[PDB]
Symmetry: C2
Subunit: 321 residues, 2 copies
């Protein structure tokens, strides 16, 4: 690799992002990247986590999405001191809402910062992203990590905030949305072998087999998602889909896979009302894909997904169409 | 790899892109992807080439950029019949402009279709992209392939077309822009000047950090551009990942490159970073520099498009 950020904030990367986008500024030595056009008129949403997953979360900072993201070393969450610094900065007395991915280390650092901010008079509220339905190789309980479906919280909560939602209303929206999101991934590795339900850090999949084409990979992931969501039994047939490359899978492979998945989900009697395809949350250079499904439980969520943002990894909107 | 499109149009990929994007339509079995929003009031620009370089050129189809792109099998240009299909469809008697990357096979196929269209009364004109300053590792003659800076042609000509540029004026602009564009890449041992299809670099050396890599690429770019001799110090920069290089590495590299360019006395006035034109899953980066020869070029770069790989614009700022 060209750079390695084991044990250090990726300072060069964050400075490069600042240099590229007029609307983003980075605070050196802190890992904090912020939307410099944010005017404090609406409730801010922030997030953060380890490097190694870009564009999560640096590519989701911008108008209509996150006001700031705090990035730590490779696969290590930011320190509570830098999280607290970011909370105080975006705060203006209207509350601050935090999205935290469900990892032990991330929980500890965010908890510590949020507790401290609240003692200072800041009304910080939070939701924990837990969409990963892969399972722990030891006892077969779901891992419940926060993975690529986290970005749907960034997008929907950011858009409702931008339209004027109060801190109380954003929390209630978060509590409704978060349970609806389900994500499952697969990786390839040479011996070629296919690991279904690979963890976001390479943890073992629930089943490994010889590669014999991607149609059967799509069938398996769809069948495993069906076992959790049970869409066969649910009246609302409308879904949001993400097809996410985990780092080294090509656009050709991602859109080919999207095609196979869409054909299967059509046969399941579902209507995919929104989809987004690309490297949305990676794991270094892993060769794999994850699929995220989320019920369109409120039709308004489609409006919130389609609205334009200033964040570099979500610049598209329905005025394109 | 989950799919392999050796020898065939990447039909599922194209169908998938179609399902994703309302403003894009794919024509089954042709490799033709088009902007279904295009209204024929302006001169259409089109391109194409083999699969394996995505988003070049499917990601650059949309309002303000290409009205269509024609994609062939892995590393094989589309057949002339499909190119000519595309030309006929975008045509409305206002001319049609084609951007062709400088590879022997692409030139044969596009030439066949262009001359055929011309004898059917279509005023088709073209420019050849040749920004690659890498060298054949024996003999060191420049290769002059069309590589990532091609997308500067798409964006500038597209935006000028969209603005109402005549076919005459677009060709003149294309002839002005094309010679300003210079691009060199590196793969990961480090191989400097790796070919776009994996051909050997001019020098292989041990990895000793990316600062020395930025220095070597900027030095080779300088040898061609000679920016120290020219009073206009304004440039456009692309930092392009060649397939499996991560965003962390690409923006880190941009940073190191911008540190050096500023010490050279240059003002980088527009920058774009990402997987802009790839080579399968190759681990590597290319840098493109282009003189802001005419200040209006920046307007053309900053204007909004509907193409999926180029959605940034100046209202974000």
């Amino acid at each position: 690799e060209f750079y390695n950020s084991t044990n250090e904030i990726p300072e060069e990367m964050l400075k490069g992002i600042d240099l590229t986008y007029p609307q983003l500024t980075y605070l050196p030595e802190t890992g904090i990247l912020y939307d410099n056009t944010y005017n404090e008129k609406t409730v801010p949403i922030i997030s953060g986590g380890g490097s190694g997953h870009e564009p999560a979360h640096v590519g989701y900072v911008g108008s209509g999405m996150l006001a700031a993201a705090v990035t730590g070393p490779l696969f290590i969450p930011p320190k509570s001191k830098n999280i607290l610094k970011a909370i105080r900065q975006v705060n203006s007395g209207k509350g601050v809402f935090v999205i935290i991915k469900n990892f032990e280390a991330d929980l500890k650092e965010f908890n510590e910062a949020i507790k401290e901010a609240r003692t200072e008079g800041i009304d910080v509220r939070y939701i924990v992203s837990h969409d990963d339905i892969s399972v722990n190789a030891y006892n077969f309980h779901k891992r419940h990590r926060g993975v690529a479906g986290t970005i749907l919280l960034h997008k929907i909560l950011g858009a409702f905030a931008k339209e004027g939602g109060s801190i109380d209303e954003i929390e209630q929206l978060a509590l409704s949305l978060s349970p609806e999101i389900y994500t499952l991934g697969v990786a390839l590795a040479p011996v070629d072998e296919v690991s279904f339900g690979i963890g976001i850090h390479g943890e073992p999949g629930y089943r490994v087999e010889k590669f014999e084409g991607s149609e059967r990979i799509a069938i398996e992931l769809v069948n495993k998602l069906k076992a959790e969501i049970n869409w066969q039994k649910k009246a609302n047939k409308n879904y949001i889909l993400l097809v996410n490359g985990l780092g080294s899978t090509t656009l050709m492979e991602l859109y080919s896979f999207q095609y196979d998945v869409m054909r299967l989900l059509e046969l399941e009697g579902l209507s995919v009302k929104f989809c987004k395809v690309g490297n949305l949350m990676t794991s270094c250079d892993m060769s794999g894909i994850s699929l995220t499904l989320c019920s369109v439980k409120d039709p308004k969520w489609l409006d919130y997904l389609n609205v334009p943002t200033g964040a570099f990894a979500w610049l598209e909107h329905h005025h394109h169409h």
